[PDB]
Write a protein that binds this ligand. Sequence first.
Ligand code: HEM
Ligand code: HEM
Ligand SMILES: Nc1ccc2ccc(CNc3cccc(F)c3)cc2n1
Ligand SMILES: Nc1ccc2ccc(CNc3cccc(F)c3)cc2n1
Ligand SMILES: C[C@H](O)[C@H](O)[C@H]1CNc2nc(N)[nH]c(=O)c2N1
Ligand SMILES: C[C@H](O)[C@H](O)[C@H]1CNc2nc(N)[nH]c(=O)c2N1
Ligand SMILES: [Zn+2]
Lengths: 409, 413
Amino acid sequence: PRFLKVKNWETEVVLTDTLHLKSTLETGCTEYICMGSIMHPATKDQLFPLAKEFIDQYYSSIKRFGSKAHMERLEEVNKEIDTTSTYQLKDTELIYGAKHAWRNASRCVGRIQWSKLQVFDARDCTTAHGMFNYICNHVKYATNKGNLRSAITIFPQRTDGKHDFRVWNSQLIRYAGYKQPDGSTLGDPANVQFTEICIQQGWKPPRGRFDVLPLLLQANGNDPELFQIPPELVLEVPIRHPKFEWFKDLGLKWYGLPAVSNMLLEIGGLEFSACPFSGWYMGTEIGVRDYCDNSRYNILEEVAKKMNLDMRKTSSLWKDQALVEINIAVLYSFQSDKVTIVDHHSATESFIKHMENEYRCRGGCPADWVWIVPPMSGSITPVFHQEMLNYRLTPSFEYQPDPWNTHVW
Amino acid sequence: CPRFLKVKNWETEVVLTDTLHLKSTLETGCTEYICMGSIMHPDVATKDQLFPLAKEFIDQYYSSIKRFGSKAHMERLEEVNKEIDTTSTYQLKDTELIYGAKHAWRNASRCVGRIQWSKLQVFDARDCTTAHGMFNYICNHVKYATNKGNLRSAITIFPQRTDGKHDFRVWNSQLIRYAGYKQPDGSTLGDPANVQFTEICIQQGWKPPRGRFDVLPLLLQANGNDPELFQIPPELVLEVPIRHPKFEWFKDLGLKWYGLPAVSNMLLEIGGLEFSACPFSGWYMGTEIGVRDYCDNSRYNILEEVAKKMNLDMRKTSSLWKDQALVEINIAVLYSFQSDKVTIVDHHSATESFIKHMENEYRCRGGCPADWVWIVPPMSGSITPVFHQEMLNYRLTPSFEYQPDPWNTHVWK
Ligand code: HEM
Ligand code: HEM
Ligand SMILES: Nc1ccc2ccc(CNc3cccc(F)c3)cc2n1
Ligand SMILES: Nc1ccc2ccc(CNc3cccc(F)c3)cc2n1
Ligand SMILES: C[C@H](O)[C@H](O)[C@H]1CNc2nc(N)[nH]c(=O)c2N1
Ligand SMILES: C[C@H](O)[C@H](O)[C@H]1CNc2nc(N)[nH]c(=O)c2N1
Ligand SMILES: [Zn+2]
């Protein structure tokens, strides 16, 4: 139980962390073994302290800790957990809970935006058709003709675990991936399995390189149902390069809206298994990971060829040159089409400013260096030289099992 | 802790099982509730602290040579035990010294070059008594390791710590580094990382040339005495001018670096013994020079000058002019070393070798401690295989450790 200091080795700025003392969940590390690079490390009785903990910090946050209203809410919650084995969040608590889950997301470089989140309460939803409707509205609001706005739509919380709401898509908008007879893959290889599942369910594939997948929506534990997002809601950006006029000939494009739909939102012990949320892209997510991962679109080789680079030895850094150029193209393309995007230099600078804000007003900011540092040009961004402390605060976004591994039809 | 910990590669889907972590010796700084993986740095031992550390090491050693529980093993235990009892310390056999040194490297979680761990030339300097002798040992090390460009890894090991008042120390952070000078106008000439050390050298009597690439003198402390200055013979200092295969103007920048990376301020810990002066050396990965030494803001900081000559649009960050320049600089570094026939390894080759090394270690040893934050290169992270590799970080002994800078602790005579 100590105040812990973090140092930036470039600016020499030292911050003092006290916030970590309030954390209650585990990191996955031990005194003897650090696991910082591992990607994936109820009952009434369990429920009430978790609920009380959350109500406590909520009333503490609006400067009414120990108020009439505070105690009454506590009374109300325990008595509701008692009778029904669960409880329902106030609209105000729901919005607070969702913003703080984003605020506490140690892996997210975009958290300077945390309090600017549009929260859609979908807790009255009963069917997959209703889910589809709420999701269309979410996509339309968030896309906003290219001026993207951060949003989250929250479907009903888990009850018995046999009636979960799940969006089976990993994101609301993604491209299909196809196994070919010659053993190669068409489209996005990361979605090959999901695409097969959709096909089995009756989806008719265009079998192109960038086919927008249908929504697969599961309501109240029932079999998931297929829906086609209205295409006019799906903003895409054809990728071209400001100097290489041949770049457009690659036929590359991407969607404007990154909308993660497979995570679990946890607030006060309650579990929201369906909580698709969205902001906007950092260029490297598309330009580095999506396009250049060997297990993804894997385009480095093709680009470097058109750049006429020497590809015989690795020490020519041909991979590195082509990587920067692809990322220039992505940024240039989005900007030219007036679609919100942020480069990794701008994003990491804001994060450092955000950290400083959080230490000042909250006494800390949980941060996962492994995820915060961008997948290219690491050390020429300020976060590389920033020491971070990682710890788990609630409310939070958590991983959950892929739905096809748990569901019985 | 369970006996089995699994790590996955998200790119190849290969899963490895670690059991070696059970032999972890010290804390990492992390707990169940906080991770300190991005923290840089998170008076002698008694008789009674020393017995178990020596035994732990002797057991490991005899186990490694397939003579565990042998008569020679038991007689070695008894000899060490008595020696600690009668003198409060003990002396390693040459074989144990060599074993321990190599294994400190094998156990270094932040080192991406460990596929080479077993090829390490160990120079035994435990007979050294003076700074002049330290200088002699260091010169021979530099000459051997350099090998006219065909670099060979080596370590030179000076006498272990006794009462803590007779430490041997190399005050230099590396055997070969460039001077930095703070100007009265606030600017820095040379390497800003070395300003403090440079000022100490000047104070001890060094006459600086005051240039951009002045090789610093050795500042050497033997047996707890005040440190002494020596100039490394310049013929022993292999350097490489930096030029570029396409950009003719790149030579005009007047950049050069030294061939031999030789870290000299770490402590080597073997079986509870502490070697406070153990300079070691290998060869460079390009990014160490091209990204950190040259492009860090608090270092040589050349991105802007390079970008201006590439005539890049440097008005928006989103032009990625920094990223563009960074690559060309690293191309030039690699090209210049290769052209001059000086050993160097690019980050693609190094990380690819490390993955294979790590897999071999999981199979033959039951694990390989690794610090992802250090193993992943400072540029192009996700296009190297290590980015996608899960790792477990833990501390095995023998090990290399940080120790306080000696000017903070030294009692001047
Ligand atoms: C608004 C602009 C935003 C930007 C620029 C941004 C940026 C990023 C980036 C680059 C990552 C790493 C992604 C990866 O490599 O897969 C990330 C992770 C993450 N973001 Fe943000 N983000 C934004 C908005 C949001 C919002 C609105 C939420 C939730 C309400 C959120 C929650 C998270 C979470 C939970 C992770 C970690 C996911 C995981 O652990 O798998 N982000 N963010
Ligand atoms: C033979 C070629 C070698 C290569 C290519 C190599 C590569 C590297 C690199 C790139 C780093 C990161 C350094 C930084 O970013 O500042 C590192 C760290 C390290 N290396 Fe290796 N190395 C080599 C040889 C050696 C040898 C011979 C030893 C000791 C016997 C050693 C022990 C270490 C240690 C202890 C660290 C971590 C230092 C710290 O925590 O500050 N390396 N190495
Ligand atoms: N630009 C953003 C905004 C929010 C994000 C939230 C989570 C993730 C994590 N990456 C992820 C998650 C699910 C599916 C997928 F393909 C990537 C990335 C984000 N990227
Ligand atoms: N190429 C190599 C070989 C061995 C290394 C050992 C340690 C370090 C760590 N960097 C370092 C350590 C001390 C002083 C210094 F200036 C740099 C880098 C290496 N780099
Ligand atoms: C092994 C490692 O944990 C894994 O590849 C992580 C590394 N850092 C990352 N960082 C971000 N932002 N996104 C990622 O998917 C990953 N992948
Ligand atoms: C703050 C952070 O831990 C620090 O900048 C680290 C990051 N990773 C590194 N990795 C290597 N190889 N060398 C370094 O000096 C650092 N610095
Ligand atoms: Zn840790």
